[PDB]
Design a protein around this ligand. Sequence first.
Ligand SMILES: Cc1cc2nc3c(=O)[nH]c(=O)nc-3n(C[C@H](O)[C@H](O)[C@H](O)COP(=O)(O)OP(=O)(O)OC[C@H]3O[C@@H](n4cnc5c(N)ncnc54)[C@H](O)[C@@H]3O)c2cc1C
Ligand SMILES: [Cl-]
Length: 509
Amino acid sequence: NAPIETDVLILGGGPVGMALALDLAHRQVGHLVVEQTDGTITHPRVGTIGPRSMELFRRWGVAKQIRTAGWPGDHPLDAAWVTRVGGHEVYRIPLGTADTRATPEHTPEPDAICPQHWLAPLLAEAVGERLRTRSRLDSFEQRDDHVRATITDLRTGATRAVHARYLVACDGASSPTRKALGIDAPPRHRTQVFRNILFRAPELRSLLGERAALFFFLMLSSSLRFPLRALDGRGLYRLTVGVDDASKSTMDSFELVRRAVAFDTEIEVLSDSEWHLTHRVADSFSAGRVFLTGDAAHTLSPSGGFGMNTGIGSAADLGWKLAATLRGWAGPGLLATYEEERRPVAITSLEERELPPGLHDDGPRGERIRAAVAEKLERSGARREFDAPGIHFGHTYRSSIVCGEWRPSARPGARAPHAWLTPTTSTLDLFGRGFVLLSFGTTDGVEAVTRAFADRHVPLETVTCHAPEIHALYERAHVLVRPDGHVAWRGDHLPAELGGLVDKVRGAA
Ligand SMILES: Cc1cc2nc3c(=O)[nH]c(=O)nc-3n(C[C@H](O)[C@H](O)[C@H](O)COP(=O)(O)OP(=O)(O)OC[C@H]3O[C@@H](n4cnc5c(N)ncnc54)[C@H](O)[C@@H]3O)c2cc1C
Ligand SMILES: [Cl-]
């Protein structure tokens, strides 16, 4: 069989690889995803989806299916520090429910909960035929204008040759592609080992009632503290305990869960495995026509789903730069800006106690003791870890393709702010294709910008907005937004040399 040709070969069908596939599909770029496994999920590793990631899934047309995948609209989203699930509570941060939560002001897409066993199937359905499961990329050989990859269909043992213009490795933290390329990714922190116990407790939610929660942090003893999370809000829970220097023995999985649950109820352990997390960032995000994205480029903190959200955001960044180069309007230096703009996000993120006696006491004394701990927890800004839009929306690119000059801002490099145009359409819904020039009030000079972009064959759409509130939000009369939704330039007056502007934002300067 002759070699199969495609513009982009995506190695790895994990969350990031599928996000990239969705962005390329959205941009009408030919691609193929090879996944060595069968796509099945036996122990969900991800579930929390940040609001920015959802804005991206919105753009890619799957936000609806994600939000309706099964998480209960009436399940509490609270985070609670307790001596035992169903026992004395120390500190609880009320976060409402999916159905009662107040509409977010800075985004059309609040965060979502979609465990991997629901997420994988949905993404695979959206990507369709382009996803090849049970397919293993064995090796790749770069050529001058393309990359040759050898893939083994694990069902037939037959090997196929795939010639792609670009190979994007979304093959995870231990990325064999990164190693093959000779790119180093030195550890940025000691390795953290986590023991994950996935269990099913059918009646636990009923026993908890409104005292149920998404996140439970157990304070069983000074030597035993760990999170226990509602995974699907329908019976599945995941206890994650650290196996550190304090870990002396390996307690029985069932006994650990029973110890963490105050109720005498049905508990069935489904899986008991470990995760060795080593924060690493690739020294380089590409070599020739081979790129690294997701954990392969940056294995980061899973706190608040930061690592996965960053991976999805990096996939969206590379997606538009690849499409622009493939279509021919990108400057030769555009692809290099993927590392320039995304590597700093990863780097910056990495740069970033005992229990009082009687804490589990029933009397009014223990209640007072728990109260005290609650104060320390709150003052330590523990509640800010559940209300920090800046972490999700605040990164601002200061790069070679951005013309320089938490609260939403349209400053160059930042994510253009959300505002409703209609009850169903946000300013964000205007972004994601090509460049967009938003003009508030006057349109003088806009025709000139239009021609400047056409001369370079750079896609541009111009939109005239008459809403004074949105103008106030954006602060300037004209705002040029990039294909990724970030601002490239703004001002009350269009620049004199538009040729220079067009070349700068497309990576040609
Ligand atoms: C045991 C374990 C437990 C984890 N627990 C958590 C957790 O509790 N919380 C959290 O936030 N994160 C957790 N993670 C990490 C989380 O899964 C990732 O951060 C996340 O999905 C990032 O995704 P990624 O898309 O970059 O890569 P991955 O999701 O790692 O996917 C890489 C994909 O590459 C494929 N692949 C690799 N080599 C080849 C090849 N040669 N040919 C074809 N396909 C190939 C794999 O089969 C896989 O599907 C865990 C990871 C592991 C391994
Ligand atoms: Cl090309």
